[PDB]
Short mmCIF file of C-alpha atoms and ligand atoms in Angstrom, two decimals:
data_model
loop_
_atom_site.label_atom_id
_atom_site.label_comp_id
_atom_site.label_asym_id
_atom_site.label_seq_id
_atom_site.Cartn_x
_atom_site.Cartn_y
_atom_site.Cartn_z
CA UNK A 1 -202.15 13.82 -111.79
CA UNK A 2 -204.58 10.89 -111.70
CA UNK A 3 -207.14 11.54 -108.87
CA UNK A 4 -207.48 15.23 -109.87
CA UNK A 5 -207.84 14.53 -113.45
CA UNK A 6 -209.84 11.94 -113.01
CA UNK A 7 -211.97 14.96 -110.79
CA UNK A 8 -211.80 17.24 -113.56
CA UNK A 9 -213.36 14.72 -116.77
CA UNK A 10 -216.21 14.06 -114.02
CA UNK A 11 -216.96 17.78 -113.26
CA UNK A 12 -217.01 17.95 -117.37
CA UNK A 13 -219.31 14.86 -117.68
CA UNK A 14 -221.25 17.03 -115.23
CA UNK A 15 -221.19 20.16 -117.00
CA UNK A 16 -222.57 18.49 -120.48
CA UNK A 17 -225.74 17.87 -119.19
CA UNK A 18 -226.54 21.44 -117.88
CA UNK A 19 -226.68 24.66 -119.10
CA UNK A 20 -223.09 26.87 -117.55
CA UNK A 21 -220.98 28.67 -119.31
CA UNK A 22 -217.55 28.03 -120.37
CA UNK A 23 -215.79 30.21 -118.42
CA UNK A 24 -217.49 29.10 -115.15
CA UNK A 25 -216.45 25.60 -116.17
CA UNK A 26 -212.89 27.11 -116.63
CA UNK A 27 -213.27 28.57 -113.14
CA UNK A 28 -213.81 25.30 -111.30
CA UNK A 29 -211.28 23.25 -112.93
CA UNK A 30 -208.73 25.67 -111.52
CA UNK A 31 -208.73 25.48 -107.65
CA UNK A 32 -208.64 29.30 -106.34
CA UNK A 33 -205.76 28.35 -103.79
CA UNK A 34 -203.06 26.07 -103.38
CA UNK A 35 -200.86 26.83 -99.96
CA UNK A 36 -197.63 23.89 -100.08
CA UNK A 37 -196.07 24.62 -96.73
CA UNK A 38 -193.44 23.63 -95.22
CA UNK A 39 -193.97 21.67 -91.25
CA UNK A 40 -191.23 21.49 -88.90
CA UNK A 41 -191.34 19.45 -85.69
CA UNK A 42 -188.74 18.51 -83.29
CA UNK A 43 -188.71 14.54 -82.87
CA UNK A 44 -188.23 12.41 -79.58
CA UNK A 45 -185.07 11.93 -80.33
CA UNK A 46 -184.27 15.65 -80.43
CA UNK A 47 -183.97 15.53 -84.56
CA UNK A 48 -185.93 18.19 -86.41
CA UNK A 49 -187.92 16.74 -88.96
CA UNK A 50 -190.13 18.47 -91.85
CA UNK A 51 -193.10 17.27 -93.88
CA UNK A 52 -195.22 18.72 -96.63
CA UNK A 53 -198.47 20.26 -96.01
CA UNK A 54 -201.04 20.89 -98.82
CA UNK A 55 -204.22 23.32 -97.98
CA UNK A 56 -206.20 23.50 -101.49
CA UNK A 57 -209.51 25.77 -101.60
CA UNK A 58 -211.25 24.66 -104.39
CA UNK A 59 -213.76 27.36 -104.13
CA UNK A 60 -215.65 29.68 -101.85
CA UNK A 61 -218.52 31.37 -103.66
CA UNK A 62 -220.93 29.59 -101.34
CA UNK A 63 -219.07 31.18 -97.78
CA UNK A 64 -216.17 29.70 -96.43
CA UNK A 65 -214.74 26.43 -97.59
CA UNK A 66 -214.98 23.08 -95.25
CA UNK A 67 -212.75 20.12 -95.90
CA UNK A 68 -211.08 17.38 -94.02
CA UNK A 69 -207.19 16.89 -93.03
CA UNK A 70 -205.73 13.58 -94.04
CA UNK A 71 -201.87 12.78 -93.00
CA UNK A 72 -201.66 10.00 -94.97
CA UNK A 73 -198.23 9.08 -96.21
CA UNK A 74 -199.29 8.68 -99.61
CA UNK A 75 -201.89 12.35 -100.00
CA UNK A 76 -200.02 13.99 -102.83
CA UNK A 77 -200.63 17.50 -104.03
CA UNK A 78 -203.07 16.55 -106.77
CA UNK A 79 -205.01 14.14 -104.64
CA UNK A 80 -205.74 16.59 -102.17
CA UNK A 81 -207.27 18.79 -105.54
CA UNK A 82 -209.33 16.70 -106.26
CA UNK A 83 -210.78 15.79 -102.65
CA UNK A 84 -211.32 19.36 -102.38
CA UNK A 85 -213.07 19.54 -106.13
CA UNK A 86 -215.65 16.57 -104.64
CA UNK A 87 -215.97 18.50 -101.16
CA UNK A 88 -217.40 21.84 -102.93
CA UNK A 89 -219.91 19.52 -105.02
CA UNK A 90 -220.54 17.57 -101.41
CA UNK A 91 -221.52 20.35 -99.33
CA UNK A 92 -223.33 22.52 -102.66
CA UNK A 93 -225.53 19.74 -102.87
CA UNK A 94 -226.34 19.88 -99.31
CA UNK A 95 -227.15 23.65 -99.75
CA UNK A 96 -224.62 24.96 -97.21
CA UNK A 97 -222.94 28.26 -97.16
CA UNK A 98 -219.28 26.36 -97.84
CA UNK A 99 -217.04 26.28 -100.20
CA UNK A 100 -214.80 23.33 -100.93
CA UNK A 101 -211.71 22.67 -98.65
CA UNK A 102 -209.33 20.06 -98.54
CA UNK A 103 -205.81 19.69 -96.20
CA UNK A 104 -203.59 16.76 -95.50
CA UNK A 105 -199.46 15.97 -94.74
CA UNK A 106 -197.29 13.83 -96.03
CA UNK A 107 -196.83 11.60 -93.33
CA UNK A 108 -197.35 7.85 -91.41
CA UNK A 109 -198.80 8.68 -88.29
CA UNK A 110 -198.39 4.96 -87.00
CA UNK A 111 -194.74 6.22 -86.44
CA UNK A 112 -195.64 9.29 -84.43
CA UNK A 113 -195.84 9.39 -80.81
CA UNK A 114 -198.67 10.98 -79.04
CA UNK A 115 -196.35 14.36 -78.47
CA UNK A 116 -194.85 14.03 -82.25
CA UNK A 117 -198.43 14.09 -83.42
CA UNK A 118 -199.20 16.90 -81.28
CA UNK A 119 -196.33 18.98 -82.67
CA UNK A 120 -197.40 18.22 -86.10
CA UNK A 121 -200.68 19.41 -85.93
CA UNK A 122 -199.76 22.58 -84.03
CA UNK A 123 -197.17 23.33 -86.72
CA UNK A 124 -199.29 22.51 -89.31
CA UNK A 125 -201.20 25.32 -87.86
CA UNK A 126 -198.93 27.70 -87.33
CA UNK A 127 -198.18 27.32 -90.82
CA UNK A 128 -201.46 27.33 -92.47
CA UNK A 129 -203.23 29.83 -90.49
CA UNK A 130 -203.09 32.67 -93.14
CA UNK A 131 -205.29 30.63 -95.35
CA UNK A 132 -207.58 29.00 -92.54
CA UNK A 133 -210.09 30.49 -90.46
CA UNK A 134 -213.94 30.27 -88.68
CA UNK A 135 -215.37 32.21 -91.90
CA UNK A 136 -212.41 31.37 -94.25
CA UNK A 137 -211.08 27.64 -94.28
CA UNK A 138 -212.57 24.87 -91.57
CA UNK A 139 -210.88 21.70 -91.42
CA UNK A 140 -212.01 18.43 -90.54
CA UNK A 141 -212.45 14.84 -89.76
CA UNK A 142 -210.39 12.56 -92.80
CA UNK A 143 -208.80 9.86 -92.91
CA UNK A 144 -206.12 9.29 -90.33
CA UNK A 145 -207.08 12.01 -87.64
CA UNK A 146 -208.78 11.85 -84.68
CA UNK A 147 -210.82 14.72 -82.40
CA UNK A 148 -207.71 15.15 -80.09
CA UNK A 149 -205.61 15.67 -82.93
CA UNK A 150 -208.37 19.09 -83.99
CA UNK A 151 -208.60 19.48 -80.10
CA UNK A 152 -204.37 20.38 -80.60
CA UNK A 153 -205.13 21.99 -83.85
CA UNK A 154 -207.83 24.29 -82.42
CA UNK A 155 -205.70 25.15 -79.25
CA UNK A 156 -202.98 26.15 -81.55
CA UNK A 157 -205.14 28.36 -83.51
CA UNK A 158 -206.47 30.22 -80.51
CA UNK A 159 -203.46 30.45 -78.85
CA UNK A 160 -202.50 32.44 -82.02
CA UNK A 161 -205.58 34.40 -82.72
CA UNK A 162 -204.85 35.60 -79.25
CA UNK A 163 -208.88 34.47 -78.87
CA UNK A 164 -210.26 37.51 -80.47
CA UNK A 165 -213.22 35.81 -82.42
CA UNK A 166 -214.44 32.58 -82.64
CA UNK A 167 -211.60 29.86 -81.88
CA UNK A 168 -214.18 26.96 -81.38
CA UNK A 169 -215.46 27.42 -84.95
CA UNK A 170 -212.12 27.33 -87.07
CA UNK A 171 -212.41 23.64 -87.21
CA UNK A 172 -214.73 20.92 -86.60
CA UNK A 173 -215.01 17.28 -85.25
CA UNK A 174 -213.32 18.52 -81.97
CA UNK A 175 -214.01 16.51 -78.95
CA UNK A 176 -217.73 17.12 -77.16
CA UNK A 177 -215.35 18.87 -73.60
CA UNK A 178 -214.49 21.85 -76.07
CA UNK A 179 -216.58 22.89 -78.61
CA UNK A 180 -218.06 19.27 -79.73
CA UNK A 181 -221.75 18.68 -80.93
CA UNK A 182 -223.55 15.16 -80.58
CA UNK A 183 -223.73 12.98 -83.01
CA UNK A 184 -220.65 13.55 -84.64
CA UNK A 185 -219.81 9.83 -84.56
CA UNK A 186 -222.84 8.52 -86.10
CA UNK A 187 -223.13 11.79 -88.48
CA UNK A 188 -222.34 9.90 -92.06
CA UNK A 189 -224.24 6.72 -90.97
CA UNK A 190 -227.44 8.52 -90.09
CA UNK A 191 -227.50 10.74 -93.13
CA UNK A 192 -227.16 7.53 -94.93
CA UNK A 193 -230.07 6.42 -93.33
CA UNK A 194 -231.64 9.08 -93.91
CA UNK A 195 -231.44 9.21 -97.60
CA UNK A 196 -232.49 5.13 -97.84
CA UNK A 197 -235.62 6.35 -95.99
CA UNK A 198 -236.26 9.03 -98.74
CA UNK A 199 -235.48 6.91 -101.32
CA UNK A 200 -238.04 4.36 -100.20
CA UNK A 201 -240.08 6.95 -99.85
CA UNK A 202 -239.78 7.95 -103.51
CA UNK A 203 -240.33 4.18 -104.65
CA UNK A 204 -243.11 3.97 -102.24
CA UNK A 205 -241.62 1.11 -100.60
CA UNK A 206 -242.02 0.12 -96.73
CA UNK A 207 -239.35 -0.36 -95.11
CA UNK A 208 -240.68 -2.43 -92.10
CA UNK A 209 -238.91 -5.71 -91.92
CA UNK A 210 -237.33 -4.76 -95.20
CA UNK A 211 -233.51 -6.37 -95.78
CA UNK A 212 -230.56 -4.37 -96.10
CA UNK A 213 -227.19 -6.11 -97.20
CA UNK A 214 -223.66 -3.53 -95.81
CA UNK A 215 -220.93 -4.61 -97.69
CA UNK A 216 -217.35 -2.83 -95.70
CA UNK A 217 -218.17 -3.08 -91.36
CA UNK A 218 -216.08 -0.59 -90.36
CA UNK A 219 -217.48 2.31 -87.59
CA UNK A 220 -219.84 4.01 -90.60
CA UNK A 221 -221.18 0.28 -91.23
CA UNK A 222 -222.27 -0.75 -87.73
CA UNK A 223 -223.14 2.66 -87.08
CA UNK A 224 -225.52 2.25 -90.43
CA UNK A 225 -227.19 -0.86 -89.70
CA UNK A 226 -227.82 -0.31 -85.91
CA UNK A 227 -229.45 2.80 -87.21
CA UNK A 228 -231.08 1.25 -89.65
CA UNK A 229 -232.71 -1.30 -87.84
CA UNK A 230 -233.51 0.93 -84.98
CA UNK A 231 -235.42 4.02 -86.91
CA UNK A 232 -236.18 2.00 -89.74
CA UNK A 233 -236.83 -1.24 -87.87
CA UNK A 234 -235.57 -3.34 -91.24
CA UNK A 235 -233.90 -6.79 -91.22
CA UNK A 236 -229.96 -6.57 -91.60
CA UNK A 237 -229.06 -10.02 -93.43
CA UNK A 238 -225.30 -9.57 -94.32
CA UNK A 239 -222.60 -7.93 -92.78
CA UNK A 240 -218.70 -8.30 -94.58
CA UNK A 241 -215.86 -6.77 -92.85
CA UNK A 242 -212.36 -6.46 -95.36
CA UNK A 243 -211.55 -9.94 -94.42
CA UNK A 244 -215.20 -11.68 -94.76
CA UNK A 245 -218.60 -11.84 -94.52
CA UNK A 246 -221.57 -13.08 -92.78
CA UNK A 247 -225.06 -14.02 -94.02
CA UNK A 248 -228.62 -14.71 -91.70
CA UNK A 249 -232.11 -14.58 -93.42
CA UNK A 250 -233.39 -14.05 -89.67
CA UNK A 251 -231.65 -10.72 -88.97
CA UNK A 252 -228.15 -9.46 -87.71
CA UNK A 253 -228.02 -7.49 -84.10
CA UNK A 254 -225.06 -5.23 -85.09
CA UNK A 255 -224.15 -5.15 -81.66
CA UNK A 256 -223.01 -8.68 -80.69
CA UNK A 257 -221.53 -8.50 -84.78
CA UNK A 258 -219.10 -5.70 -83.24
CA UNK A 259 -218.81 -7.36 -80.21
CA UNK A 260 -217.51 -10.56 -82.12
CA UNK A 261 -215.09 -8.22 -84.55
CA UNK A 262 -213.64 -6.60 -81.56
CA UNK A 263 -212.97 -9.89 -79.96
CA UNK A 264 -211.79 -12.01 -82.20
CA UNK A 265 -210.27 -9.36 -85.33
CA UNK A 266 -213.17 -10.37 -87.55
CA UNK A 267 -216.93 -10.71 -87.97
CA UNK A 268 -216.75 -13.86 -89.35
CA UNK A 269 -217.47 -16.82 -87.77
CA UNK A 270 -220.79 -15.01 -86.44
CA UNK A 271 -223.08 -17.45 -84.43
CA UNK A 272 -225.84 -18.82 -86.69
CA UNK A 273 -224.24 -17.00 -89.81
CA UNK A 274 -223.33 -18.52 -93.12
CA UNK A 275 -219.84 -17.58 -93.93
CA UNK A 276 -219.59 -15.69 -97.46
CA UNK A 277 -217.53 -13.36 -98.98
CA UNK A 278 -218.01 -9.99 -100.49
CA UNK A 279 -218.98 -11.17 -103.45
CA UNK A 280 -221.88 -13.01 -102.08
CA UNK A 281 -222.74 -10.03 -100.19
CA UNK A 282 -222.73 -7.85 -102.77
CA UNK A 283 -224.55 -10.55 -105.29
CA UNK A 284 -226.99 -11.19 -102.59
CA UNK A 285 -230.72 -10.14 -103.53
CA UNK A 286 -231.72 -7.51 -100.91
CA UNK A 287 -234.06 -4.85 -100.86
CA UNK A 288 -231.23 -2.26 -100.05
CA UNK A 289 -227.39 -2.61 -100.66
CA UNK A 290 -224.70 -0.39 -98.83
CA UNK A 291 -221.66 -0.31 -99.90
CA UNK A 292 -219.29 1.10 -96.80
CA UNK A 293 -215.70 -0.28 -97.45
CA UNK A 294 -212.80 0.48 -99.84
CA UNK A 295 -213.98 1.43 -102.96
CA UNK A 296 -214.36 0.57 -106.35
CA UNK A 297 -216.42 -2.59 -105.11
CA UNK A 298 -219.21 -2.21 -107.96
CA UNK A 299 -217.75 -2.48 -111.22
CA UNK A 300 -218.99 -3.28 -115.18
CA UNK A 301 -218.04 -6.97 -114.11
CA UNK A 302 -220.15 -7.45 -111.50
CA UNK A 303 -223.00 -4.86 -112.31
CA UNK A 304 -225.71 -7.19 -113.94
CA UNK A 305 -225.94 -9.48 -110.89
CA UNK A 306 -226.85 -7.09 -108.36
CA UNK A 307 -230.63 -7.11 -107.29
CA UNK A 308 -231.34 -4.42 -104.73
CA UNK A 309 -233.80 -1.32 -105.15
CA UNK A 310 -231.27 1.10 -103.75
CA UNK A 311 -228.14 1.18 -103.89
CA UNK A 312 -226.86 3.64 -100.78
CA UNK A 313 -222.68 4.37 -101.80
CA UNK A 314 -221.63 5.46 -98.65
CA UNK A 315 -217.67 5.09 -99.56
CA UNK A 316 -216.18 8.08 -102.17
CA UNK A 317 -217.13 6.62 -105.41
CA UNK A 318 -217.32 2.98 -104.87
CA UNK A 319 -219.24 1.89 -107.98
CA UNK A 320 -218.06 2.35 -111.08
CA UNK A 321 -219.43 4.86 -114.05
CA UNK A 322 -220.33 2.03 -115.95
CA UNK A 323 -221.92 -0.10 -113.13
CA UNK A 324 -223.58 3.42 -112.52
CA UNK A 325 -225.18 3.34 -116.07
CA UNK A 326 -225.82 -0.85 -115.80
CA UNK A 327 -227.57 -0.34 -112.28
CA UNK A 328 -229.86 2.24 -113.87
CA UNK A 329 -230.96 0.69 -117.05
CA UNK A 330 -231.51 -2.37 -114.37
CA UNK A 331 -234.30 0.08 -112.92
CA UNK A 332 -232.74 0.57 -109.86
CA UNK A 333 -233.13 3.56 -107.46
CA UNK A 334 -229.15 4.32 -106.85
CA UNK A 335 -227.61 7.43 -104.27
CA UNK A 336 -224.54 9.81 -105.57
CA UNK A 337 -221.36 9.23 -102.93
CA UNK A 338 -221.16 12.44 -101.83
CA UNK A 339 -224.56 12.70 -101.34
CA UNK A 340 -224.91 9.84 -99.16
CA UNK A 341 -221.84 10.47 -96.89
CA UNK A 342 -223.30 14.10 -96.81
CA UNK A 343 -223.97 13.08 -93.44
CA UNK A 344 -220.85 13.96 -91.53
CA UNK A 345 -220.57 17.30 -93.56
CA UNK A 346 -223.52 18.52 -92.41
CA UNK A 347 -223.29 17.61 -88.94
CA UNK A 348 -219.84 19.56 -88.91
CA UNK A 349 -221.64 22.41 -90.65
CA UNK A 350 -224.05 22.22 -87.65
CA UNK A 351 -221.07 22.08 -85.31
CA UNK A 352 -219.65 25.08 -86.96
CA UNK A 353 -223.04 27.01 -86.16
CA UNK A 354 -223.26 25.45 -82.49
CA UNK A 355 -219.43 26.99 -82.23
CA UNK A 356 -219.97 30.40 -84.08
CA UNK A 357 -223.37 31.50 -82.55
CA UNK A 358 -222.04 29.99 -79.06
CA UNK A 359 -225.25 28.15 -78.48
CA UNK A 360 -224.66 23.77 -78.37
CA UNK A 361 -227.78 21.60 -79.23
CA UNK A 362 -228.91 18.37 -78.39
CA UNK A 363 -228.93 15.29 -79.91
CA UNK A 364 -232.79 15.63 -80.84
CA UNK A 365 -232.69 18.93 -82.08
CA UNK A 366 -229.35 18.06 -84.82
CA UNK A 367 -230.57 14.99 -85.46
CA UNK A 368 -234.10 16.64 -86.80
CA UNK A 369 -232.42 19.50 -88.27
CA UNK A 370 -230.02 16.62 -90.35
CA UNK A 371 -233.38 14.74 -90.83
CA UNK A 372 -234.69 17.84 -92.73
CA UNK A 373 -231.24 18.62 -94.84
CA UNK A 374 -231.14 15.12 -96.20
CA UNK A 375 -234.57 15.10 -97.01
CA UNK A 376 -234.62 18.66 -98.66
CA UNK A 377 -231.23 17.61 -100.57
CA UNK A 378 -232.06 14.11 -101.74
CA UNK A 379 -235.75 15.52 -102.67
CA UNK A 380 -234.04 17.88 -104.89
CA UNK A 381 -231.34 15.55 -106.25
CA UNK A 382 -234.28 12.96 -106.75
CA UNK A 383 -236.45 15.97 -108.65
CA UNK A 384 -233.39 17.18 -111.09
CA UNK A 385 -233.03 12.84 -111.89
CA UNK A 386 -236.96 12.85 -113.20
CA UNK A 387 -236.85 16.07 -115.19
CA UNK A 388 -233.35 15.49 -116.31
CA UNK A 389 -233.84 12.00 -117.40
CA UNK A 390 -230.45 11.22 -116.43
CA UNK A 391 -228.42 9.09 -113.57
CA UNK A 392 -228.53 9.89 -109.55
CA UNK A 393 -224.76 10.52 -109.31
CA UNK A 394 -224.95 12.98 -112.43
CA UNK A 395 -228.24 14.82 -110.86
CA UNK A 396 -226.68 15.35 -107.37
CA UNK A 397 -223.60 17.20 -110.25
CA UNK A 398 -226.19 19.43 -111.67
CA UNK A 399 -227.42 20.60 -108.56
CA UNK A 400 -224.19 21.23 -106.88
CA UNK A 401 -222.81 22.78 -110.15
CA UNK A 402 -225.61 24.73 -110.82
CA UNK A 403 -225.75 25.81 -106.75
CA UNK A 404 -222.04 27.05 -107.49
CA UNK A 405 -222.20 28.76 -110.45
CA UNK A 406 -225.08 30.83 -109.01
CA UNK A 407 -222.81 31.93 -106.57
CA UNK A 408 -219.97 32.58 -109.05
CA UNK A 409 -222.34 34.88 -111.25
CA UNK A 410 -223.76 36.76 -107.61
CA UNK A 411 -220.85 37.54 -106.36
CA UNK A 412 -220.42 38.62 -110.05
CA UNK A 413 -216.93 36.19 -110.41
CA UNK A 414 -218.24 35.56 -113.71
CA UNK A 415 -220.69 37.89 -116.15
CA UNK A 416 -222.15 34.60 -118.27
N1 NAP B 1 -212.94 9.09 -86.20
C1 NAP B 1 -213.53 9.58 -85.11
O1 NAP B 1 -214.02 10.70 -85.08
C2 NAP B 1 -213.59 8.73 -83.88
C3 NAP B 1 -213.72 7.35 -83.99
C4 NAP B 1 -213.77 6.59 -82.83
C5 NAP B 1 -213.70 7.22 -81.59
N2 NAP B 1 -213.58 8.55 -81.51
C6 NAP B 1 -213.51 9.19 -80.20
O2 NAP B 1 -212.37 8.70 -79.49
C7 NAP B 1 -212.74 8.05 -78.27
C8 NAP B 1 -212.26 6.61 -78.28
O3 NAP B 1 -210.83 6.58 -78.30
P1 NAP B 1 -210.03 6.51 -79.69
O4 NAP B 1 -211.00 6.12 -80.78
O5 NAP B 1 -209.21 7.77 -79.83
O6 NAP B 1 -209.02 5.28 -79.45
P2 NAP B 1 -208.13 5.20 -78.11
O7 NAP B 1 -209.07 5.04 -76.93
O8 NAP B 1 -207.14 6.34 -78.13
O9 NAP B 1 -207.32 3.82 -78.30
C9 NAP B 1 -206.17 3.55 -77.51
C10 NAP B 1 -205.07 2.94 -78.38
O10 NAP B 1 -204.36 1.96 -77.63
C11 NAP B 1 -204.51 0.65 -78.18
N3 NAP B 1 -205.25 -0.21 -77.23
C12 NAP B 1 -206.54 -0.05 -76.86
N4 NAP B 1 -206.92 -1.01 -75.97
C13 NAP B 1 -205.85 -1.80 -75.76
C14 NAP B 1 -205.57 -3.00 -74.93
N5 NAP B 1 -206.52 -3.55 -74.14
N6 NAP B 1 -204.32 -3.52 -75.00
C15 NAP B 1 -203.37 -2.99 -75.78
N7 NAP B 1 -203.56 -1.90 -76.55
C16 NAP B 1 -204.76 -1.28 -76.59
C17 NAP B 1 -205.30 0.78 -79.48
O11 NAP B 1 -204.51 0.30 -80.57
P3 NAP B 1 -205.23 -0.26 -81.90
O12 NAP B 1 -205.78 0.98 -82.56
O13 NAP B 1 -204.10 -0.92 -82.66
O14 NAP B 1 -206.28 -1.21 -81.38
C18 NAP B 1 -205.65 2.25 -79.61
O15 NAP B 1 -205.12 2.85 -80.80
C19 NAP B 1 -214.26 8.13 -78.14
O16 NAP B 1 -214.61 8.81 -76.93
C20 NAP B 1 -214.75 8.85 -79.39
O17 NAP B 1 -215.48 10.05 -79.09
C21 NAP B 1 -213.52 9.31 -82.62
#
């Protein structure tokens, strides 16, 4: 339907500025499975109640695909398609052995109990495990789920592998007691950081003192500017949560901000802080803008006004196509979605190592080996954008298209 069509006209906007053949193109419209299963579980009440499962595996020419599970009441069939379509262009342009993955249920989980969420996820396992695997299909952290729901998921799948290989590695964001890796929390955050550091780094720019506006305060957001202003050591001068928005020249401690939205529901009100609104926010003239909330937030409406040298999308596709073309002929240094939320992907990639070899690292070790991923992966994106002469968003495409079609034509999928 809509989101997967939608997927489809941007992998062909993609595709017309670099050089893969027809069929390929063919290739990756079409997903190469689609498993719609059936998920029974047994209510409190005694009742037996089913839901619809979707598994889609967009592609696996790079090694086995990686995607997240979201039980969402409203994931239909052809939004999980096209999650799956962005995942294999998130994790090509990453360079990781994965192929694109993508699972989710049709269901409200604010309705299930603790044990009723349990019994989903085991059954959603015990029906999907002939698709799934450590070296096949790894799902992950989406919307909706969280690590004790994969902690029941993985425990299902081992009880039913009877633990012949690798049970720890069929899925990732479990909890750190069973098969967990550090810095799985802050994962998307610091590989946002990461790429605002390369992208000064490309403008030249110093980023001491520097003043980043975060637009969307959710987990990724505080996580992002505590970050930022620890590594990076710049000024944070607006913070907006969905409701409002705060504003200080001086410089925002992200801590006592989350401190204040935990207490009283909001950041607003902050001590010391003009109270704005997104707009403002997003309007204000920064050196760096970070867009982490619902998206769509940049649009051809309000693309003109906005000021800052890099724009850092952490959210899937929050500006616009249009604002995408404004904010470059603005000469402004913007970052591809999926290449900015890379973050978390890679960290579960490096979880999925930690699990498979059966060696864990430490927090120093995966946060230097996601400090060299970014910077390979943005250098790239950042090199294709110069020769190319085209946008950030559509470079980050090439790459990832180009990365997969390679694949296709090794494994000899396709002959042109
Ligand atoms: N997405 C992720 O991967 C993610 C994110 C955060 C944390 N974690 C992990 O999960 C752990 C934190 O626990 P959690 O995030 O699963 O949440 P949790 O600790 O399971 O939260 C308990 C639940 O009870 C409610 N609650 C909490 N305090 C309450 C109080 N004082 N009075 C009444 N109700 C209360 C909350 O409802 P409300 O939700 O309505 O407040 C919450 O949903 C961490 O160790 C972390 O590793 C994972």
């Amino acid at each position: 339907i809509d989101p997967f069509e939608m997927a489809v006209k941007q992998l062909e906007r993609a595709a017309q500025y670099m050089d893969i053949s027809e069929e390929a193109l063919e290739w990756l419209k079409k997903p190469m499975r689609i498993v719609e299963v059936s998920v029974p579980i047994e209510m409190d009440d005694g009742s037996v109640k089913v839901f619809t499962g979707f598994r889609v595996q967009h592609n696996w020419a790079r090694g086995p695909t990686k995607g997240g599970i979201r039980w969402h009441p409203a994931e239909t069939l052809s939004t999980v398609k096209a999650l799956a379509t962005w995942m294999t262009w998130k994790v090509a342009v990453v360079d990781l052995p994965y192929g694109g993955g993508k699972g989710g249920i049709i269901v409200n989980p604010k309705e299930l109990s603790e044990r009723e969420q349990e019994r989903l996820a085991r059954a959603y396992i015990r029906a999907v495990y002939d698709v799934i695997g450590p070296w096949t299909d790894i799902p992950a952290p989406d919307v909706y789920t969280n690590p004790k729901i994969m902690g029941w998921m993985m425990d299902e799948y081992e009880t039913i592998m009877r633990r012949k290989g690798p049970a720890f590695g069929v899925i990732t964001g479990k909890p750190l007691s069973i098969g967990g890796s550090l810095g799985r929390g802050t994962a998307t955050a610091q590989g946002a950081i990461f790429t605002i550091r390369e992208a000064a780094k490309a403008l030249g720019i110093d980023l001491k003192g520097k003043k980043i506006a975060v637009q969307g305060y959710g987990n990724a957001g505080y996580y992002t500017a505590k970050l930022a202003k620890e590594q990076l050591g710049m000024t944070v001068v607006a913070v907006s949560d969905s409701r409002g928005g705060i504003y200080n020249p001086d410089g925002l401690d992200p801590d006592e901000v989350l401190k204040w939205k935990r207490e009283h529901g909001s950041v607003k009100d902050f001590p010391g802080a003009t109270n704005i609104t997104n707009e403002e926010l997003l309007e204000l003239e920064v050196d760096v803008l970070a867009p982490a909330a619902i998206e769509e937030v940049i649009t051809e409406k309000n693309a003109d006004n906005i000021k800052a040298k890099i724009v850092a999308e952490v959210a899937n596709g929050p500006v616009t196509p249009e604002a995408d073309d404004i904010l470059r002929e603005k000469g402004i240094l913007q970052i591809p979605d999926f290449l900015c939320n890379a973050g978390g992907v890679t960290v579960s990639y490096f979880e999925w190592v930690q699990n498979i070899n059966g060696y864990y690292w430490t927090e120093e070790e995966v946060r230097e080996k996601l400090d060299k991923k970014m910077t390979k992966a943005f250098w790239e994106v950042y090199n294709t954008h110069k020769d190319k002469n085209i946008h950030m968003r559509d470079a980050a495409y090439v790459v990832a298209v180009s990365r997969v079609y390679q694949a296709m034509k090794d494994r000899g999928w396709v002959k042109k």
